[PDB]
């Protein structure tokens, strides 16, 4: 209902892409 | 103490005027300085396999040290490593009791030093004291230059890349003190085909430019005590305070456009056998081993005439005809490179050499993917941050004339 | 009730603005990109192009791309729901219909984009520069993304959303469409290049030629929409650049127009140069220049030169880049220098 | 050749001594 | 069997902080430490031991 | 090679610089 | 003002999505083994348009 | 180098410490009041 | 790990430039 | 007597155009490379850039136009040598051999070094700061790394950039060919650099020319900004240096080019278990440049 | 007369250069 939606919007996935790309580097 | 002014980029800046704390950020600068050099020695040390040459395993210090005749032999063979070894860990070492009042003089000490005497003591105006430090460093310059000039003649050093037989450490018996040799470099062309101070085919040149170097910077730096700045500092000439550092901004940047240059083109000063085969040589020596090859199996082909009627390569390698190197120096010639010695004079040394400057040409990217060559990151590197104190220099002396 | 109360929550004030043009813009924006970082995060071009081009097949930041459709794709829509994928959205991703996706929100983003700086000036009550300065980016992305590979075959001739994929886009239109002889294309660069040299010139002038140095430099007051414009001299500066180049503004109105107006004018050229070039009309030769090279073989220039390296560029990328095509050049009929 | 390599050494040594000199020598007045 | 630097480069690990903060600190201050307690005789003129102790490998290596 | 082309060159050279001169010429005598 | 409810079970999640090997069934991206088949050397290439999807169901039973 | 194969990984990560003065400078000015 | 023993907490120089760091504001 | 008069006439900011102290290096240098290039660019003879016998013919009498004519660059028996007129054993063998090139781009060099003494000396003269001088030193820079720089790495003046638009797209082809210049990040900042600063250019542009109402000289300027825009001073500085440090980092970036020094060549980046190589972007790349490459002989 | 088009369009280009620079409209 308010702005912060820019941080559910916007953080979250990033958080999580944060993670599946720290997790890439381990693979191999 | 932050106090006043220089927002949080221009905190050295705050060293302006504190003439005793800004002493012994220099002193752990250089203690910084001798760190950089002997843990890059230890850690080239620690990654070394003698019997490959020093251009395949990425080593810039200890080509440096091997340039001086500490353990090496005939054609780069290694002999002893504990010459470098020591020359890394004096210099760590040296780094340390040098570190030491990096952090007295800079933290410990005192703030200033116009409370102490003549001496020790300085104010960027009083150009009685600064002409003293000046030349009180110059007598240290020529110091130096001349601990070279030791090393040459009295300590056994100075590897030269042009003895007779592959190239051996060589003692320096007579240097050339003449001066119409000597200066005589400093008024070539720069362009192609004589270098302008870069064409350093002798080793004795070497020396009795040091020797030049020696007693004029002594000479001089004996000068700039007993005198005073004259006439010609205020017409022409103008005078600052905090300038001095653009002044030695913009002259070191010239050292690097001219240190990039030696290093790409010359070959005595930095031998191939430790630094790996310039620009001329690699091509060169494929264009002489294409002859050689195609003479056992299978003017001619390959050599053709130069634009002054010389005996050169032909193909591609035209444009790097005007190097000179001692693989070759037996081959060449009265008019240039002559074929019938290609048979004549030939021996198993200068074969392996060309052969192997041949598969070692300078090439490759910033991820080290080609090899790339220790030549080709000394003239990048030198040539950028000569470039940049080019625009350190346009900043400094553009904020410091306006006072 | 119904409206004017939705009309004054969007034009309130907030820490972003969101108009009428947000709803068009944020959400087209963030699904654009979105779908480019979870395209080059996790979705392979393996089944489209041949290639790996995602952070989970090992690739860095320069290799990733949410590449093109396949050629046999054409100029499909490739919706979600649509006839080739059928709601699955594995096979969405597979077929490049990712590529489709950030291409119209690209687009509808855009045009949300451009609504939302003539909603701003609606209101700060400004005449819209900036929207008629925006119409230039819309144009290049229209012409490349949109009307480029709508003129061509199918969606695979595009670009494919990436650093090197762009590289390749550019050697493309260097080897199969000589692009760099293109007219059009010339005033572009001329655009581009006499605009960041408008740049810098400025921005050095205005710099120096400074009301206040430093001495008696009373700091008046300073609003952010006169983009600092009280604060230097125009008279000193016309006196600098007619005696250095000997041509010099004399109008703060004057020059701003011809900021504005330099790089919008470059970059419209070059839409109507991509505009040709999605048609295959491109200016590949000169047709005199042609017959003076068949007439003697001895003739040699270096547009001639550039030819032969378009034909390089052309014969050695073409099995790779088209896959679909199943070229087999044997290395006999591949162009070397030295046959 | 000479003719002309003369004439250009004139010239450039000309020009580079007339820029030092009035580099220098003539500030005010 | 020169174990004696295995045990000694300790020493200097311990050294490159009372040089840190056991006098100076960070600025002109005192607190203690250099008025009259282990820097000018007592218990930091050894760093001149160390160097000592870290030349006293010369002929340990040669 | 164009012997029409030339005339392309001509008219594209010509026909805006009459326009522009013409305005000239004709703004100067009364602006 | 302070916000500490779930940030690192977020990145559990990133993690649990690709060290399982959900990424590649959800994305569709092949597995480093699963490029190729276990035979040929030939790229998958989409040859058609409405059957597609059929094609790619097609290759992936080879694997 | 030479019979120092205890302290080798310390030299292969040694010359990296200077350049990383830069980076204690950074904490350093960071909490003093920057 | 590479050692046992001769592998530590190697972060000496984050731990003391941290020192002038964090008791210099400790510090008046 | 009369010297004074010719020391009053130079240092005069009360000219037509500046002619300053540098002026006086500035003028004949900068016209001697112009009339020698529309006389080479108009009429010249065919050079070998090469050392055999094929001469490229770059000049407009010899059968070319606008866009394909060029002023080639010397030969590669030639090399780094200096080669003006008089070094030659004919007026022909110097105009076969690409001898108006090098005179041509060393006047030039000369005279635009010039030019930016002769801006900051009147910058000095009018009582301005010297910034112009620094902006005008990056395109001064690039033309130095792509006429000097780059011949001097690579060992001959046949490998700097020709005097003409298609010789100019043959350099930029033949370089990514030698180089991948466009994964080299020092040109993609580059890139950067002028496509934000024609970005900043009509987005400064627009936004000030939408935000000024009237401004009057009485011939004391007067403007009056129309202010107050929706939910220190600079923005020229950014402006300026956006731009300038973009164009600074390719010079040097073709400057460390010149050495070898060259890109980024991801080849073969990703693998299959079963020993087989699965390409990438970077392979299509590495694969048109082996196009160009070979077609360079 | 395809040379001379050329050459003639850049001549004209300079006259126009030199009737900019010093035929300047007067403020
Ligand atoms: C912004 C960027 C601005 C850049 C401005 C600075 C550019 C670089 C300045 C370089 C300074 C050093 C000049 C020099 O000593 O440069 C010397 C080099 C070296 O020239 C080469 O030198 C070769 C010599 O090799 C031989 O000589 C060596 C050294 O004597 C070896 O010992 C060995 O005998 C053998 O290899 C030949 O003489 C060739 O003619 C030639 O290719 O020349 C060259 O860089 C070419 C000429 C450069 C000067 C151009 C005018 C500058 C004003
Ligand atoms: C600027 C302002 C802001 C802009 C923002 C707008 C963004 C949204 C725009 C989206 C447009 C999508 C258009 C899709 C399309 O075009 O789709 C293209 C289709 C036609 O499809 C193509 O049709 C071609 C011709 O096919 C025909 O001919 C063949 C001959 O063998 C066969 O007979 C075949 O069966 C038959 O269909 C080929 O088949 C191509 O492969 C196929 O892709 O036209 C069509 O739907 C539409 C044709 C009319 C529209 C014209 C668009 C402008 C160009
Ligand atoms: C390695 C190079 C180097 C060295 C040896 C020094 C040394 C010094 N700096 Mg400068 N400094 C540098 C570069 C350097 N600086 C860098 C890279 C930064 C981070 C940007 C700083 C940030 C900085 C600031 C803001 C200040 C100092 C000051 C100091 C002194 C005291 C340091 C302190 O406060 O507690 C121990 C000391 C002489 C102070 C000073 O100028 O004294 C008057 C001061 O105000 N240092
Ligand atoms: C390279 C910079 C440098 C310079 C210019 C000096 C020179 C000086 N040192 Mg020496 N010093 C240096 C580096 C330097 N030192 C280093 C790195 C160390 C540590 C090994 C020392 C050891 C040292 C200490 C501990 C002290 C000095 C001090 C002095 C001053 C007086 C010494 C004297 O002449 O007494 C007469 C002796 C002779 C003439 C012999 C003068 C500043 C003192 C000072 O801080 O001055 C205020 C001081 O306390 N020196
Ligand atoms: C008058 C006696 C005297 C002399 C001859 C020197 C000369 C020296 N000083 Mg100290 N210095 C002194 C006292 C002196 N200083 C005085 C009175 C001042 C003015 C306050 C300084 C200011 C000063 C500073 C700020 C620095 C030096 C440095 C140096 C060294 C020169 C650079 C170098 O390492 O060359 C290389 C060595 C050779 C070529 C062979 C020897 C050398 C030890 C530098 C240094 O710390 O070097 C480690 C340094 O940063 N000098
Ligand atoms: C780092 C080296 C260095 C530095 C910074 C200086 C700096 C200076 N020199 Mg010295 N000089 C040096 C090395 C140096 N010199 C050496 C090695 C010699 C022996 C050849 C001289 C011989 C010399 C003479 C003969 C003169 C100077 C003069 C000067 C002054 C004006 C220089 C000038 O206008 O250049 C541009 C200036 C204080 C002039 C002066 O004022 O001396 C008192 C002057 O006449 N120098
Ligand atoms: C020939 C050797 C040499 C020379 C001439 C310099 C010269 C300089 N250094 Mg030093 N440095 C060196 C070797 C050298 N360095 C070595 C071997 C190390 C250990 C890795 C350092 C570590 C060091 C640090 C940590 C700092 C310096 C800084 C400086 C500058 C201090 C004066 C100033 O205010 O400039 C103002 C400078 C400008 C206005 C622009 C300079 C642009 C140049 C091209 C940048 C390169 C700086 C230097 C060469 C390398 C720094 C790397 C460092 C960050 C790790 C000056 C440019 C200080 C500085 O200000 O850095 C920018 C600084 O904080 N240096
Ligand atoms: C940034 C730091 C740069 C450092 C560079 C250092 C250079 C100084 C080293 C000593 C040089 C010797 C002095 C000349 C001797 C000579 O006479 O050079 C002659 C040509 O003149 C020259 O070469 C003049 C060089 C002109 C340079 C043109 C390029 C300018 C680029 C833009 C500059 C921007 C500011 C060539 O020699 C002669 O060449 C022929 C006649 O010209 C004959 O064969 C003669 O017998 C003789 O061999
Ligand atoms: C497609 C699609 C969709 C969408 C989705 C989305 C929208 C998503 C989003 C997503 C997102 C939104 C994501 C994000 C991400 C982020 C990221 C990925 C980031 C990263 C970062 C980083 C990596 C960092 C880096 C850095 C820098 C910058 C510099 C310094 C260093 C560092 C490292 C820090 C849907 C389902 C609807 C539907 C279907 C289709
Ligand atoms: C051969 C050789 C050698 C020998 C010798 C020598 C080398 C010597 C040196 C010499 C020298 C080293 C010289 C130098 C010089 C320098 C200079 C010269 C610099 C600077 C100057 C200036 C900078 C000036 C300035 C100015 C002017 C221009 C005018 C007025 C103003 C002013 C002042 C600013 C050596 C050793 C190397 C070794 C080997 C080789
Ligand atoms: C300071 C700058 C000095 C520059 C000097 C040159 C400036 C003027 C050049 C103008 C070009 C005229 O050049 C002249 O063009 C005609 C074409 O019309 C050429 O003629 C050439 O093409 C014509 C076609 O028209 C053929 O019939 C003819 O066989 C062929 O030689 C002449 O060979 C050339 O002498
Ligand atoms: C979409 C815009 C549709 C406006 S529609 C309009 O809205 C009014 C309320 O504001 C109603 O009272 C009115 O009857 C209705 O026709
Ligand atoms: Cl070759």
Redesign the pocket.
């Known amino acids: 209902t308010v702005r912060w939606v820019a941080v559910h919007t916007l953080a979250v996935p990033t958080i999580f892409f944060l993670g599946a790309i720290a997790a890439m580097q381990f693979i191999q | 103490q932050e106090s006043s002014g220089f927002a949080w980029w221009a905190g050295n800046a705050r060293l302006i005027n504190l003439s005793?704390k800004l002493?012994?950020a220099?002193?752990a600068h250089?203690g910084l300085i001798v760190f950089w050099a002997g843990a890059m020695t230890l850690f080239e040390l620690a990654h070394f396999i003698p019997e490959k040459p020093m251009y395949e395993q990425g080593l810039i210090l200890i080509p440096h040290i091997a340039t001086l005749g500490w353990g090496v032999g005939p054609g780069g063979e290694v002999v002893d490593t504990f010459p470098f070894f020591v020359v890394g860990v004096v210099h760590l070492i040296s780094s340390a009791?040098?570190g030491?009042?990096?952090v007295?003089?800079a933290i410990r000490?005192?703030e200033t030093?116009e409370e102490?005497s003549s001496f020790?003591g300085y104010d960027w105006k009083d150009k009685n004291k600064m002409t003293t430090i000046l030349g009180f460093h110059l007598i240290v310059l020529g110091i130096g230059a001349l601990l070279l000039v030791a090393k040459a003649m009295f300590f056994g050093g100075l590897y030269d890349t042009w003895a007779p037989g592959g190239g051996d450490v060589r003692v320096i018996t007579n240097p050339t003190l003449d001066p119409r040799v000597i200066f005589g470099y400093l008024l070539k062309s720069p362009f192609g085909g004589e270098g302008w101070i870069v064409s350093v085919n002798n080793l004795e040149d070497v020396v009795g430019g040091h020797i030049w170097i020696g007693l004029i910077c002594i000479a001089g730096g004996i000068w700039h005590i007993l005198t005073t700045p004259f006439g010609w500092a205020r017409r022409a000439f103008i005078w600052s305070g905090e300038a001095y550092l653009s002044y030695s901004l913009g002259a070191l940047s010239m050292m690097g456009f001219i240190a990039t240059c030696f290093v790409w083109f010359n070959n005595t000063v930095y031998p191939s056998e430790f630094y790996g085969p310039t620009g001329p040589e690699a091509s060169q020596a494929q264009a002489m081993t294409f002859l050689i090859r195609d003479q056992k199996l299978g003017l001619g082909k390959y050599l053709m005439r130069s634009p002054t009627g010389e005996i050169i390569f032909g193909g591609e390698t035209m444009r790097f005809w005007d190097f000179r190197g001692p693989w070759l120096e037996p081959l060449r010639g009265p008019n240039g490179l002559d074929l019938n010695k290609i048979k004549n004079d030939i021996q198993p040394w200068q074969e392996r050499r060309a052969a192997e400057y041949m598969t070692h040409a300078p090439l490759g990217s910033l991820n080290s993917v080609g090899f790339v060559s220790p030549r080709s990151w000394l003239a990048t590197s030198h040539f950028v941050l000569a470039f940049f104190f080019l625009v350190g220099h346009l900043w400094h002396a553009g904020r410091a004339r306006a006072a | 009730g119904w409206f004017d109360i939705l009309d004054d929550w969007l034009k309130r004030d907030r820490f972003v603005f969101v108009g009428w043009s947000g709803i068009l813009l944020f959400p087209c924006a963030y699904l654009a990109l979105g779908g480019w970082l979870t395209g080059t995060t996790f979705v392979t071009s393996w089944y489209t192009h041949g290639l790996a081009s995602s952070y989970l097949e090992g690739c860095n930041f320069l290799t990733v791309a949410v590449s093109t459709p396949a050629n046999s794709m054409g100029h499909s829509l490739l919706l979600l729901w649509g006839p080739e994928a059928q709601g699955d959205f594995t096979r969405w991703c597979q077929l490049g219909g990712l590529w489709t996706f950030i291409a119209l929100h690209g687009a509808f983003g855009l045009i949300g984009f451009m609504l939302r700086q003539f909603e701003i000036a609606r209101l700060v009550g400004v005449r819209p520069y900036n929207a008629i300065a925006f119409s230039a980016p819309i144009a290049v992305f229209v012409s490349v993304f949109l009307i480029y590979p709508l003129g061509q075959s199918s969606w695979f001739f595009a670009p494919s959303f990436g650093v090197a994929a762009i590289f390749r886009f550019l050697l493309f239109f260097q080897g199969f469409h000589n692009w760099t002889l293109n007219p059009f294309h010339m005033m572009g660069v001329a655009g581009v290049l006499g605009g960041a040299l408008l740049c810098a010139i400025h921005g050095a002038t205005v710099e120096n030629t400074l009301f206040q140095d430093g001495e008696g430099a009373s700091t008046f007051r300073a609003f952010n929409p006169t983009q600092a414009e009280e604060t230097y001299s125009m008279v000193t500066a016309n006196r600098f650049w007619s005696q250095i180049f000997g041509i010099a503004f004399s109008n703060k109105r004057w020059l701003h127009f011809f900021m504005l107006f330099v790089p919008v004018t470059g970059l419209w050229m070059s839409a109507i140069g991509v505009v040709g070039l999605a048609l295959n009309l491109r200016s590949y030769d000169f047709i005199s220049q042609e017959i003076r090279a068949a007439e003697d073989p001895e003739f040699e220039t270096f547009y001639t030169k550039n030819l032969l390296l378009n034909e390089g560029i052309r014969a050695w990328m073409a099995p790779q880049d088209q896959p679909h095509e199943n070229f087999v050049f044997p290395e006999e009929v591949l162009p070397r220098g030295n046959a | 050749m000479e003719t002309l390599k003369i004439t250009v050494y004139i010239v450039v040594t000309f020009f580079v001594l007339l820029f030092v000199f009035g580099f220098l020598s003539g500030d005010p007045a | 069997m020169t174990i004696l630097f295995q045990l000694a480069l300790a020493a200097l690990v311990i050294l490159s902080f009372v040089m840190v903060i056991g006098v100076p600190v960070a600025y002109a201050s005192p607190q203690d430490w250099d008025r009259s307690k282990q820097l000018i005789f007592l218990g930091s003129g050894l760093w001149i031991a160390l160097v000592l102790v870290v030349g006293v490998l010369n002929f340990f290596v040669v | 090679v164009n012997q029409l082309g030339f005339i392309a060159t001509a008219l594209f050279v010509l026909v805006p610089s009459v326009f522009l001169i013409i305005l000239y010429v004709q703004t100067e005598s009364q602006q | 003002v302070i916000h500490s409810i779930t940030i690192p079970a977020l990145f559990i999640a990133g993690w649990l999505f690709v060290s399982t090997g959900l990424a590649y069934d959800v994305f569709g991206t092949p597995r480093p083994d699963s490029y190729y088949a276990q035979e040929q050397r030939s790229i998958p290439l989409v040859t058609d348009r409405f059957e597609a999807k059929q094609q790619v169901e097609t290759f992936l039973e080879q694997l | 180098p030479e019979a120092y194969a205890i302290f080798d990984p310390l030299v292969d990560v040694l010359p990296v410490i200077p350049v990383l003065f830069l980076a204690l400078a950074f904490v350093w000015q960071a909490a003093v009041g920057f | 790990e590479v050692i046992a023993q001769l592998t530590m907490i190697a972060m000496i120089g984050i731990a003391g430039p941290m020192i002038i760091f964090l008791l210099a504001v400790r510090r008046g | 007597n009369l010297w004074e008069r010719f020391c009053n006439w130079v240092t005069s900011t009360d000219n037509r155009l500046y002619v300053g102290w540098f002026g006086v290096i500035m003028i004949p240098t900068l016209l001697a490379a112009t009339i020698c290039f529309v006389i080479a660019f108009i009429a010249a003879p065919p050079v070998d850039i090469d050392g055999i016998r094929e001469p490229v013919s770059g000049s407009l009498l010899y059968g070319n136009n606008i866009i394909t004519g060029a002023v080639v660059p010397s030969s590669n028996a030639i090399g780094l040598h200096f080669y003006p007129i008089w070094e030659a054993a004919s007026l022909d063998e110097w105009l076969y051999n690409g001898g108006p090139y090098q005179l041509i781009i060393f006047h030039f060099l000369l005279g635009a070094s010039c030019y930016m003494g002769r801006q900051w000396e009147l910058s000095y003269r009018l009582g301005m700061r010297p910034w112009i001088c620094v902006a005008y030193s990056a395109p001064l820079a690039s033309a130095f790394a792509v006429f000097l720089i780059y011949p001097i790495g690579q060992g001959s003046f046949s490998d700097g950039m020709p005097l003409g638009i298609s010789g100019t797209f043959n350099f930029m082809i033949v370089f990514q060919a030698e180089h991948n210049i466009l994964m080299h990040p020092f040109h993609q900042l580059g890139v950067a650099g002028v496509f934000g600063g024609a970005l900043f250019c009509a987005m400064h542009g627009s936004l000030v020319t939408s935000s000024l109402i009237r401004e009057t000289t009485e011939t004391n300027i007067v403007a009056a900004h129309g202010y107050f825009g929706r939910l220190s001073r600079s923005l020229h500085f950014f402006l300026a240096a956006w731009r300038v440090v973009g164009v600074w980092f390719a010079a040097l970036g073709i400057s460390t080019m010149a050495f070898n020094l060259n890109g980024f060549n991801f080849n073969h980046s990703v693998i299959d278990a079963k020993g087989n190589v699965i390409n990438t972007w970077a392979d299509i790349i590495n694969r048109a440049n082996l196009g160009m490459e070979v077609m360079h002989e | 007369m395809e040379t001379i088009t050329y050459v003639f369009i850049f001549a004209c280009i300079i006259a126009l250069f030199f009737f900019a620079i010093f035929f300047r409209e007067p403020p």
């Open positions: 005793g002493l012994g220099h002193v250089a009791v040098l030491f009042g990096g007295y003089h000490g005192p030093l102490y020790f």
